[PDB]
Design a protein around this ligand. Structure first.
Ligand SMILES: Cn1cnc2c(N)ncnc21
Ligand SMILES: Cn1cnc2c(N)ncnc21
Lengths: 173, 173
């Protein structure tokens, strides 16, 4: 199945959400012809939608806040799919405000998931992965559960004020 | 004190192990003057020695084998320390045969820790993190327990035929 059967529904939904939330978003899709098992195509839509919503809502900042930060007033949201060996890699990237990793550590300490003493040397991926913990902050836990149900993997990378990339790796078949 | 109180013991240890294991090793130390708290100094030696042993035994290939692979004939082992912010970062890097990630997956499947379907989409760090599972070689768990007792973090990067870099990050408090 080409993944375009899902991707093609997104531009309108993104531009709807952006206008509702008062943001200017250049939405770019790449690799929409990428083919994989239709089971994957069918199930990956709802998780992807959540990731695109996350990016527009929590990631891209309103135009007035972009310009106050000296960023381009228009935000960029990229959804891509590509073959990597016999896997498919789907990426959702924004140039928004990024994930505050210090906030994640503070909340992890607050909720008793970790000791303050350990936090000073925690890895970035270890920190970002708290986002998949169900209480923490469909949610991101459910996105991870769907991916893992498909024998896939998910990762997050982010940098404050620069933006966020979520990568999903699925088997072809 | 300067980490040299630890590092100064290692050229002897490395040359003893290289001689015993019939291996030629170009051993380089950098950052020996990097200072940190006495607690760290007296606890960090044992983990480092384990990582140097690992590099000389399982990493660096015999000279004849390096020549046959078209590598620089003598293997290089670099132990370094530096300040990063309020942290100290210690690296142990070899240009040896690297960790076979396919072998890690085969072992993890054998041990029932993952099925074939989910292994196809593991990232490199997910694969290498099997090494820190207690009893996985039946090793790195022991290094990680000491580092985490010091509130530190450890990470591994490795590629086949290229070599291995183990990094340890310590709070310095
Ligand atoms: C919590 N959160 C989840 N996704 C994001 C994002 N894309 N940008 C900023 N914050 C986010
Ligand atoms: C399992 N294993 C642990 N450390 C190493 C190393 N440095 N090179 C090759 N194999 C290794």
């Amino acid at each position: 199945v080409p993944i375009s059967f899902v991707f093609n529904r997104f531009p309108r939904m993104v531009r709807d959400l952006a206008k509702k939330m008062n943001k200017e978003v250049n939405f770019i899709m790449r690799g929409e012809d990428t083919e994989l098992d239709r089971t994957f195509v069918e199930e990956i839509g709802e998780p992807l939608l959540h990731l695109l919503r996350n990016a527009i809502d929590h990631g891209i900042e309103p135009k007035e806040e972009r310009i106050a930060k000296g960023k381009p007033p228009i935000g960029t949201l990229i959804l891509s799919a590509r073959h990597e060996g016999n896997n498919v890699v789907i990426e959702v990237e924004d140039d928004g405000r990024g994930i505050d990793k210090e906030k994640i550590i503070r909340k992890a300490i607050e909720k008793g998931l970790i000791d303050e003493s350990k936090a000073a040397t925690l890895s970035d991926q270890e920190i970002l992965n708290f986002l998949f913990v169900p209480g923490f902050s469909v949610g991101m836990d459910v996105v991870k559960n769907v991916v893992e149900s498909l024998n896939g993997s998910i990762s997050i990378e982010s940098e404050k004020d620069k933006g966020t990339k979520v990568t999903i790796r699925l088997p072809l078949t």
